Short mmCIF file of C-alpha atoms in Angstrom, two decimals:
data_model
loop_
_atom_site.label_atom_id
_atom_site.label_comp_id
_atom_site.label_asym_id
_atom_site.label_seq_id
_atom_site.Cartn_x
_atom_site.Cartn_y
_atom_site.Cartn_z
CA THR A 4 -2.24 1.17 58.14
CA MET A 5 -4.63 -0.30 55.60
CA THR A 6 -6.25 -3.70 54.60
CA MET A 7 -6.00 -7.36 53.40
CA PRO A 8 -6.05 -7.17 48.98
CA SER A 9 -9.51 -8.67 48.25
CA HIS A 10 -9.74 -10.46 44.87
CA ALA A 11 -9.32 -7.52 42.35
CA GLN A 12 -5.89 -6.88 43.13
CA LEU A 13 -4.80 -10.21 43.38
CA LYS A 14 -5.90 -11.33 39.89
CA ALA A 15 -4.26 -8.02 39.03
CA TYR A 16 -0.99 -9.42 40.00
CA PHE A 17 -1.12 -12.61 38.46
CA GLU A 18 -2.47 -11.01 34.97
CA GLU A 19 0.75 -8.82 35.10
CA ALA A 20 2.79 -11.50 35.51
CA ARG A 21 1.10 -13.30 32.34
CA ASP A 22 0.90 -10.25 29.86
CA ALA A 23 4.23 -10.07 30.77
CA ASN A 24 7.04 -12.50 31.00
CA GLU A 25 5.32 -14.85 28.11
CA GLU A 26 8.29 -13.77 25.97
CA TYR A 27 10.75 -16.13 26.91
CA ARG A 28 7.92 -18.60 29.00
CA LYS A 29 6.81 -19.18 24.99
CA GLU A 30 10.18 -19.71 24.16
CA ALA A 31 11.83 -21.77 26.90
CA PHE A 32 8.95 -24.31 25.82
CA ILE A 33 10.34 -24.66 22.60
CA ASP A 34 13.62 -25.11 24.02
CA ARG A 35 12.20 -28.33 25.86
CA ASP A 36 10.67 -29.94 22.85
CA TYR A 37 14.07 -29.31 20.80
CA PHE A 38 16.05 -31.62 22.74
CA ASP A 39 13.70 -34.68 22.93
CA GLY A 40 13.04 -34.83 19.23
CA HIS A 41 10.56 -32.42 17.16
CA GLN A 42 13.26 -29.97 15.51
CA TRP A 43 11.18 -29.44 12.93
CA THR A 44 8.21 -27.08 12.15
CA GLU A 45 4.90 -27.78 10.92
CA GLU A 46 5.54 -26.08 7.60
CA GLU A 47 8.97 -27.73 6.78
CA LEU A 48 7.33 -31.17 7.93
CA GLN A 49 4.89 -30.53 5.60
CA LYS A 50 7.21 -29.86 2.50
CA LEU A 51 9.83 -32.67 3.05
CA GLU A 52 6.68 -34.84 2.38
CA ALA A 53 5.40 -33.76 -1.01
CA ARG A 54 9.37 -34.66 -2.14
CA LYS A 55 8.42 -37.93 -0.46
CA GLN A 56 11.60 -37.43 1.57
CA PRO A 57 11.92 -39.11 5.06
CA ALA A 58 12.37 -36.33 7.51
CA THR A 59 16.15 -36.64 9.26
CA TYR A 60 17.28 -35.39 12.37
CA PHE A 61 20.35 -35.82 14.49
CA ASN A 62 19.58 -34.67 17.94
CA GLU A 63 23.14 -33.77 18.83
CA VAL A 64 21.79 -30.95 21.59
CA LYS A 65 20.75 -34.64 23.91
CA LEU A 66 24.39 -35.43 24.30
CA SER A 67 25.59 -32.19 25.31
CA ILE A 68 23.05 -32.44 28.45
CA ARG A 69 23.13 -35.55 29.03
CA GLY A 70 26.58 -35.49 30.06
CA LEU A 71 26.58 -32.18 31.80
CA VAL A 72 23.67 -33.07 34.31
CA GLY A 73 25.58 -36.38 34.88
CA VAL A 74 28.73 -34.59 36.15
CA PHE A 75 26.28 -32.78 38.88
CA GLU A 76 24.30 -35.91 39.58
CA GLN A 77 27.51 -37.69 40.67
CA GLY A 78 29.48 -35.14 42.77
CA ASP A 79 26.19 -35.06 45.39
CA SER A 80 26.22 -33.61 48.56
CA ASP A 81 24.73 -34.33 52.05
CA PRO A 82 24.95 -30.76 54.36
CA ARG A 83 27.07 -29.96 56.90
CA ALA A 84 27.59 -27.00 59.36
CA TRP A 85 30.82 -25.78 60.59
CA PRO A 86 31.10 -23.73 64.18
CA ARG A 87 33.46 -20.72 63.61
CA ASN A 88 35.00 -20.88 66.62
CA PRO A 89 35.78 -23.85 68.90
CA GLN A 90 34.81 -22.19 72.16
CA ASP A 91 31.45 -23.73 72.92
CA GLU A 92 30.22 -24.02 69.26
CA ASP A 93 31.25 -27.12 68.58
CA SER A 94 28.82 -28.61 71.26
CA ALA A 95 26.21 -26.84 69.36
CA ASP A 96 26.63 -28.74 66.11
CA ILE A 97 23.98 -31.21 66.49
CA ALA A 98 22.20 -29.30 63.72
CA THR A 99 24.31 -31.35 61.07
CA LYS A 100 23.05 -34.52 62.60
CA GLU B 250 -14.07 -58.14 44.71
CA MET B 251 -13.87 -54.57 46.15
CA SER B 252 -12.18 -53.23 49.42
CA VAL B 253 -9.48 -50.67 51.09
CA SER B 254 -6.16 -51.82 50.16
CA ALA B 255 -4.72 -54.19 52.92
CA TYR B 256 -1.03 -52.80 52.81
CA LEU B 257 -0.35 -49.93 54.71
CA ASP B 258 2.58 -46.69 54.40
CA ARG B 259 5.01 -45.12 56.73
CA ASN B 260 2.70 -42.63 57.90
CA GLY B 261 0.28 -45.52 58.87
CA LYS B 262 -2.57 -44.96 56.34
CA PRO B 263 -3.69 -47.33 53.82
CA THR B 264 -1.55 -46.97 49.99
CA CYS B 265 -0.99 -48.61 46.96
CA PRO B 266 1.76 -51.19 46.35
CA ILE B 267 2.49 -50.51 43.19
CA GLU B 268 5.71 -48.81 42.03
CA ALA B 269 7.18 -47.39 38.53
CA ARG B 270 9.40 -45.44 36.85
CA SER B 271 9.99 -44.39 33.34
CA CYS B 272 13.07 -43.11 31.30
CA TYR B 273 12.11 -39.22 29.79
CA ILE B 274 8.77 -37.55 29.79
CA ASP B 275 7.95 -34.66 27.10
CA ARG B 276 5.93 -31.47 27.71
CA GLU B 277 2.58 -33.53 26.31
CA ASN B 278 2.95 -36.46 28.50
CA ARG B 279 4.88 -38.84 26.45
CA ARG B 280 6.87 -41.92 28.06
CA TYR B 281 9.36 -42.91 25.34
CA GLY B 282 12.90 -44.25 26.30
CA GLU B 283 15.96 -44.65 24.89
CA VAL B 284 15.41 -46.03 21.08
CA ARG B 285 13.29 -43.44 20.66
CA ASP B 286 16.30 -41.88 19.58
CA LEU B 287 18.26 -43.84 17.05
CA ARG B 288 15.87 -44.13 14.72
CA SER B 289 16.36 -41.04 12.44
CA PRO B 290 19.78 -41.98 12.39
CA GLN B 291 19.13 -45.61 11.60
CA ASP B 292 16.77 -45.40 8.87
CA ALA B 293 19.45 -43.67 7.22
CA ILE B 294 21.90 -46.58 7.04
CA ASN B 295 19.31 -48.93 6.05
CA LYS B 296 18.03 -46.70 3.37
CA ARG B 297 21.36 -44.99 2.31
CA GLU B 298 22.40 -48.89 1.43
CA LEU C 349 26.67 -38.71 -7.30
CA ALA C 350 27.26 -41.83 -5.97
CA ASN C 351 30.36 -40.69 -3.82
CA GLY C 352 28.22 -37.92 -2.60
CA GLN C 353 26.31 -40.77 -1.39
CA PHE C 354 29.31 -42.52 0.23
CA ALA C 355 30.30 -39.57 1.91
CA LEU C 356 26.60 -39.14 3.36
CA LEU C 357 26.50 -42.81 5.07
CA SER C 358 29.43 -42.63 6.25
CA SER C 359 28.23 -39.55 8.29
CA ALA C 360 25.43 -41.36 9.53
CA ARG C 361 27.52 -44.67 10.75
CA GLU C 362 30.01 -42.34 12.42
CA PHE C 363 27.04 -40.55 14.57
CA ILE C 364 25.22 -43.87 15.66
CA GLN C 365 28.00 -44.89 17.13
CA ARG C 366 28.88 -41.96 19.19
CA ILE C 367 25.65 -41.40 20.29
CA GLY C 368 24.72 -44.82 21.26
CA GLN C 369 27.55 -47.43 21.24
CA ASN C 370 29.37 -45.76 23.92
CA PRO C 371 28.50 -48.04 26.90
CA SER C 372 32.38 -49.13 27.06
CA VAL C 373 32.01 -50.74 23.40
CA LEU C 374 34.06 -48.36 21.60
CA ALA C 375 37.57 -50.01 21.16
CA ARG C 384 42.16 -45.62 26.85
CA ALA C 385 43.13 -47.52 29.40
CA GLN C 386 40.52 -47.08 32.39
CA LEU C 387 40.23 -43.22 31.85
CA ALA C 388 38.91 -42.57 28.65
CA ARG C 389 36.08 -45.11 30.07
CA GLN C 390 36.34 -44.28 34.08
CA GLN C 391 35.64 -40.89 33.75
CA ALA C 392 34.75 -40.50 30.04
CA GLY C 393 32.70 -43.21 28.96
CA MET C 394 30.48 -43.71 32.33
CA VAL C 395 29.48 -40.04 33.00
CA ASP C 396 27.33 -39.72 29.71
CA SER C 397 25.60 -42.92 30.72
CA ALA C 398 25.25 -41.54 34.08
CA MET C 399 21.56 -40.09 33.97
CA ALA C 400 18.92 -43.34 33.28
CA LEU C 401 21.45 -45.64 34.76
CA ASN C 402 21.97 -43.96 37.76
CA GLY C 403 17.94 -43.54 37.16
CA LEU C 404 17.40 -47.35 37.42
CA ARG C 405 19.27 -47.76 40.67
CA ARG C 406 16.98 -45.08 42.34
CA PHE C 407 13.94 -47.51 41.42
CA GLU C 408 15.30 -50.48 42.36
CA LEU C 409 16.38 -49.18 45.97
CA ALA C 410 12.59 -48.04 45.74
CA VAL C 411 11.71 -51.11 46.20
CA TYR C 412 13.45 -52.36 48.85
CA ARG C 413 12.05 -49.17 50.67
CA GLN C 414 8.38 -50.65 49.89
CA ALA C 415 9.35 -53.99 50.89
CA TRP C 416 10.18 -53.44 54.53
CA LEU C 417 6.79 -52.23 55.19
CA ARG C 418 5.36 -55.59 54.61
CA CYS C 419 7.98 -57.38 55.90
CA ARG C 420 7.09 -55.45 59.31
CA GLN C 421 3.30 -55.42 59.76
CA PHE C 422 2.95 -58.87 58.95
CA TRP C 423 6.07 -60.80 60.78
CA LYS C 424 5.53 -61.52 63.84
CA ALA C 425 7.92 -62.63 67.08
CA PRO C 426 8.66 -66.04 65.71
CA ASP C 427 8.95 -65.23 62.23
CA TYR C 428 12.41 -62.87 62.80
CA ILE C 429 13.81 -66.21 64.73
CA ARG C 430 13.55 -68.06 61.84
CA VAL C 431 15.17 -66.27 59.34
CA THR C 432 17.82 -64.53 61.60
CA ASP C 433 18.30 -67.46 63.63
CA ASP C 434 19.09 -66.41 67.26
CA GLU C 435 16.72 -66.36 69.79
CA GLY C 436 16.74 -62.66 71.22
CA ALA C 437 16.43 -61.25 67.62
CA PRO C 438 12.87 -59.17 68.06
CA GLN C 439 13.64 -57.77 71.13
CA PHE C 440 15.32 -54.94 69.12
CA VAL C 441 12.76 -54.36 66.54
CA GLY C 442 10.19 -53.06 68.80
CA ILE C 443 8.79 -55.99 70.19
CA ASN C 444 9.21 -57.57 73.49
CA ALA D 464 20.98 -10.56 78.57
CA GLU D 465 19.86 -7.99 76.06
CA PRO D 466 19.90 -8.70 72.54
CA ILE D 467 23.16 -7.01 71.66
CA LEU D 468 23.90 -7.90 67.49
CA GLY D 469 19.94 -8.64 67.29
CA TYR D 470 19.95 -11.82 68.32
CA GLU D 471 17.59 -13.34 70.93
CA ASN D 472 18.85 -16.69 71.47
CA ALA D 473 23.20 -15.80 72.08
CA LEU D 474 23.41 -19.41 71.74
CA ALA D 475 23.00 -20.92 68.18
CA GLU D 476 22.15 -18.97 65.15
CA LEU D 477 22.78 -18.75 61.37
CA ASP D 478 24.78 -15.99 60.80
CA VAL D 479 27.27 -16.22 63.27
CA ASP D 480 27.97 -19.86 64.56
CA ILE D 481 26.41 -22.81 62.20
CA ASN D 482 27.74 -21.62 58.39
CA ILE D 483 25.68 -24.23 56.46
CA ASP D 484 27.80 -25.54 54.00
CA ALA D 485 28.27 -28.64 51.83
CA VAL D 486 30.70 -31.92 51.81
CA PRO D 487 31.09 -35.22 49.70
CA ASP D 488 28.83 -37.89 50.61
CA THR D 489 28.98 -40.46 53.25
CA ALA D 490 26.04 -43.08 54.42
CA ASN D 491 26.49 -42.21 58.29
CA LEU D 492 27.77 -39.51 60.55
CA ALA D 493 29.84 -42.21 62.04
CA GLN D 494 31.50 -43.34 58.88
CA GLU D 495 32.77 -39.75 58.44
CA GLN D 496 34.04 -39.61 61.62
CA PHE D 497 36.30 -42.84 60.93
CA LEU D 498 37.76 -41.17 57.52
CA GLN D 499 39.54 -38.15 59.32
CA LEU D 500 40.79 -40.71 62.42
CA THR D 501 42.56 -43.51 60.18
CA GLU D 502 44.01 -40.60 57.78
CA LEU D 503 45.25 -39.05 61.61
CA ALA D 504 46.18 -42.32 62.94
CA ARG D 505 48.38 -43.56 60.09
CA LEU D 506 50.60 -40.91 60.61
CA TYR D 507 51.16 -41.69 64.25
CA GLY D 508 50.42 -45.15 64.74
CA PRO D 509 48.99 -48.06 66.28
CA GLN D 510 50.22 -46.66 70.02
CA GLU D 511 47.42 -44.03 70.57
CA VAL D 512 44.41 -45.25 68.58
CA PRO D 513 43.32 -48.58 69.85
CA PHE D 514 40.53 -51.29 69.19
CA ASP D 515 37.13 -50.20 70.40
CA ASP D 516 38.19 -46.60 69.08
CA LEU D 517 38.80 -47.10 65.24
CA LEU D 518 36.37 -50.70 65.09
CA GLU D 519 33.64 -49.34 66.78
CA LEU D 520 33.11 -46.52 64.79
CA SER D 521 33.67 -48.12 61.32
CA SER D 522 31.03 -49.67 58.48
CA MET D 523 31.08 -53.47 59.66
CA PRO D 524 27.68 -55.23 58.88
CA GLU D 525 27.94 -57.38 62.53
CA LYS D 526 30.48 -55.52 65.08
CA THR D 527 27.85 -55.63 68.58
CA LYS D 528 27.93 -59.68 68.33
CA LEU D 529 31.83 -59.56 67.77
CA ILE D 530 33.16 -56.47 69.92
CA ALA D 531 31.57 -58.17 73.14
CA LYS D 532 33.46 -61.53 72.33
CA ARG D 533 36.87 -59.74 72.37
CA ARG D 534 36.28 -57.42 75.35
CA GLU D 535 35.51 -60.52 77.77
CA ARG D 536 38.83 -61.97 76.55
CA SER D 537 40.62 -58.87 78.04
CA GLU D 538 38.66 -59.16 81.16
CA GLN D 539 39.11 -63.11 81.99
CA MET D 540 42.61 -62.15 81.53
CA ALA D 541 43.19 -59.05 83.74
CA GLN D 542 41.97 -61.44 86.75
CA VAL D 543 44.75 -63.51 85.92
CA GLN D 544 47.09 -60.56 85.58
CA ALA D 545 45.53 -59.53 89.41
CA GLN D 546 45.47 -62.28 91.25
CA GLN D 547 49.14 -63.11 90.02
CA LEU E 51 11.68 -54.04 -3.34
CA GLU E 52 10.51 -57.11 -4.30
CA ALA E 53 9.12 -56.06 -7.40
CA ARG E 54 12.88 -54.74 -8.52
CA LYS E 55 13.89 -58.14 -7.27
CA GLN E 56 15.59 -56.89 -4.89
CA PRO E 57 16.64 -58.44 -1.47
CA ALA E 58 15.88 -56.30 2.04
CA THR E 59 19.04 -55.72 3.68
CA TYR E 60 19.11 -53.97 7.32
CA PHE E 61 22.28 -53.28 9.38
CA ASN E 62 20.63 -53.84 13.10
CA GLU E 63 22.78 -51.09 14.50
CA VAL E 64 20.53 -50.55 17.44
CA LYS E 65 20.58 -53.83 19.28
CA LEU E 66 24.37 -52.97 19.64
CA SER E 67 23.90 -49.80 21.39
CA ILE E 68 21.49 -51.55 24.17
CA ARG E 69 23.04 -55.14 24.51
CA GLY E 70 26.43 -53.17 25.88
CA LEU E 71 24.50 -51.03 27.77
CA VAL E 72 22.04 -53.59 29.75
CA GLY E 73 25.30 -55.30 30.70
CA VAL E 74 26.54 -52.45 32.42
CA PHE E 75 23.67 -52.33 34.60
CA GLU E 76 23.46 -56.04 34.75
CA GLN E 77 26.88 -56.62 36.09
CA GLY E 78 26.95 -54.05 39.05
CA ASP E 79 24.59 -55.60 40.65
CA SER E 80 23.33 -55.17 44.22
CA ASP E 81 22.54 -56.56 47.75
CA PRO E 82 20.22 -54.09 49.87
CA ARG E 83 21.44 -52.77 53.07
CA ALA E 84 20.74 -50.52 55.55
CA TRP E 85 22.64 -47.44 57.37
CA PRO E 86 22.18 -47.09 61.11
CA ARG E 87 22.09 -43.09 61.41
CA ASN E 88 23.54 -42.61 64.51
CA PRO E 89 25.16 -45.78 66.88
CA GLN E 90 23.25 -45.15 70.11
CA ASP E 91 21.02 -48.15 69.89
CA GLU E 92 20.64 -48.05 66.19
CA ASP E 93 23.18 -50.37 65.13
CA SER E 94 21.75 -53.01 67.14
CA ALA E 95 18.05 -52.31 65.29
CA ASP E 96 20.15 -53.49 61.83
CA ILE E 97 18.53 -56.78 61.89
CA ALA E 98 16.84 -55.23 58.73
CA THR E 99 19.36 -55.70 56.41
CA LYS E 100 19.75 -59.75 57.52
CA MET F 399 29.49 -21.06 35.83
CA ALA F 400 25.96 -22.28 36.27
CA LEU F 401 27.34 -25.76 37.83
CA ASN F 402 28.82 -24.08 40.70
CA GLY F 403 25.53 -21.79 40.58
CA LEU F 404 23.31 -25.01 40.88
CA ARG F 405 25.37 -25.79 44.25
CA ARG F 406 24.62 -22.12 45.47
CA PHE F 407 20.91 -22.88 45.12
CA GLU F 408 21.10 -26.54 46.91
CA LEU F 409 23.21 -24.88 50.06
CA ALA F 410 20.49 -22.22 50.01
CA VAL F 411 17.69 -24.37 51.30
CA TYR F 412 19.29 -26.05 53.81
CA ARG F 413 20.03 -22.45 55.25
CA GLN F 414 16.39 -22.11 54.90
CA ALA F 415 15.53 -25.44 56.40
CA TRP F 416 17.49 -25.03 59.73
CA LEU F 417 15.05 -22.09 60.45
CA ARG F 418 12.03 -24.29 60.08
CA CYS F 419 13.66 -27.02 61.94
CA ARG F 420 14.18 -24.78 65.19
CA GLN F 421 11.06 -22.57 65.49
CA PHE F 422 8.58 -25.75 65.48
CA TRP F 423 11.25 -28.40 67.12
CA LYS F 424 10.36 -28.74 70.77
CA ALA F 425 12.88 -30.29 73.28
CA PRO F 426 11.21 -33.99 72.88
CA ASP F 427 12.11 -33.76 69.33
CA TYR F 428 15.81 -33.19 69.03
CA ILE F 429 15.74 -36.23 71.64
CA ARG F 430 14.06 -38.69 68.93
CA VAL F 431 16.39 -38.01 66.04
CA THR F 432 19.67 -37.54 67.65
CA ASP F 433 18.72 -40.28 70.05
CA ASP F 434 20.90 -39.00 72.96
CA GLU F 435 19.11 -37.46 76.37
CA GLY F 436 20.79 -34.21 77.07
CA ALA F 437 20.85 -33.14 73.68
CA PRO F 438 18.70 -30.15 73.34
CA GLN F 439 20.77 -28.51 76.33
CA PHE F 440 23.09 -27.40 73.69
CA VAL F 441 20.58 -25.35 71.10
CA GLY F 442 19.47 -23.00 73.48
CA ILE F 443 16.70 -24.68 75.57
CA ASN F 444 16.80 -25.19 79.27
CA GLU G 250 -7.40 -18.83 52.54
CA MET G 251 -5.72 -15.41 53.73
CA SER G 252 -3.14 -14.81 56.20
CA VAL G 253 0.11 -13.63 57.34
CA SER G 254 2.94 -16.33 56.53
CA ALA G 255 3.43 -18.25 59.31
CA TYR G 256 7.14 -18.94 58.70
CA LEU G 257 9.49 -16.92 60.27
CA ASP G 258 13.22 -15.82 58.89
CA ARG G 259 16.74 -15.24 60.50
CA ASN G 260 15.74 -11.78 61.84
CA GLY G 261 12.40 -12.85 63.04
CA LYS G 262 9.75 -11.22 60.97
CA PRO G 263 7.53 -13.39 58.75
CA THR G 264 9.02 -14.24 55.02
CA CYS G 265 8.27 -16.22 51.96
CA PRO G 266 9.37 -19.72 52.00
CA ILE G 267 10.01 -19.93 48.28
CA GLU G 268 13.44 -19.93 46.43
CA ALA G 269 14.60 -20.38 43.47
CA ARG G 270 17.61 -19.25 40.63
CA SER G 271 17.84 -18.97 37.16
CA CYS G 272 20.76 -19.51 34.76
CA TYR G 273 21.11 -16.50 32.75
CA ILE G 274 19.33 -12.98 32.28
CA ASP G 275 19.54 -10.72 29.26
CA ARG G 276 19.06 -6.93 29.41
CA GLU G 277 15.32 -6.73 29.30
CA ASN G 278 14.36 -9.61 31.73
CA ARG G 279 14.72 -12.74 29.84
CA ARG G 280 15.63 -16.15 31.59
CA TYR G 281 17.34 -18.05 29.22
CA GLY G 282 18.73 -21.54 30.27
CA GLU G 283 21.82 -23.46 28.33
CA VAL G 284 19.69 -25.00 25.26
CA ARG G 285 18.98 -21.29 24.07
CA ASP G 286 22.55 -21.79 22.66
CA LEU G 287 23.11 -25.08 20.64
CA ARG G 288 19.90 -24.13 18.49
CA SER G 289 21.51 -21.99 15.79
CA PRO G 290 24.46 -24.23 15.55
CA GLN G 291 21.64 -27.45 15.41
CA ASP G 292 19.25 -25.95 12.69
CA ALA G 293 22.61 -25.91 10.52
CA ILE G 294 23.45 -30.09 10.78
CA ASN G 295 19.55 -30.91 10.34
CA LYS G 296 18.98 -28.53 7.23
CA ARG G 297 22.79 -29.20 5.37
CA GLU G 298 21.78 -32.45 5.50
#
């Protein structure tokens, strides 16, 4: 057997999990600030102001999420245990209480 | 005045009485509401008139 | 290019009625509003209920440590009430 | 005895005889017990599902100060139908 | 707009979306209530909702 | 899909929560919750 | 601090308590959600306006 890992192959685990999986983790934050405004990049937003044009957006991707969480959120659930065979197994269904 | 808070909690230790809640949150910490939207689709009715 | 403006205002008088003006002000007979209108206002209306019942929880902790035995009898009006809440 | 399927208690384990699963919401477990009784009492009727078995596990606010003012009337009347 | 001698009209269509959305919350109000979790001497301790 | 996938996460935590309220709750902790003397005899103790 | 994990499992051996779940997966390991879609059909409403 061996010993416990000591602070060099523990930073080497955290840094492999930051060097990789950064392609979507920097992409999922784009998806975050895409449903609460901010649908314009900083290069497109600069050029609209040079035409003296307002920067309008129609946030039609909050509608598709706000009514889809609201289906899950209404049909909530409290847990429950099912005794598999009623030969002294319903007496051991204190677990759901 | 300055003292330990007089009100207790469900664990027995003294805590805060102030309670609050916000509608939405952003990546950097913004607290917007509902009428943060309906502004870009509402400056396009006043201006296109 | 004014008939191009009327067709571009009327695209924004219709979106402003579809994202915002859902809360039972659109006019079916309790089906396009009982399962179709009140599910788009489910978040942040079942979020404010969660604040309101989180204050009642915070208010039973204050009417417990301060109300002694002759204060439960004044409200509920029954001698023999404080024996049910952990005193005497 | 010995562990037979690697189950060191042989009374209540996760795999065999618990089977955690979800179910729709209630307020307390007495109210969920109340729903699959009146559904079952409706087919038979008021003959074999009486009071103190359907009023007791209900979702009524003040019933302890009501179940004892009706139990007493079926006890001062039973002293008539015994001494007569 | 005043230099064109034009009136400054607005169509306040964002009060309509809030006034009918508070009015749903405001009608379905609620008084509190405590639920005893198991009726073995816990309904007697439901003076709290009174 | 992905609404009967989130239910599968939620009931996979309740399973992970019965393993923690078993090895730590001794006999006078089941009686406080369910409120019946004679409850821990049904879950493999005494 | 550094020790063997205190929490057990259904087999008796010590394990992890952390549990999680993602929506979709890709060929190379991406974890996208639902609003990874509705971006290409939503930059074509803001831009064609």
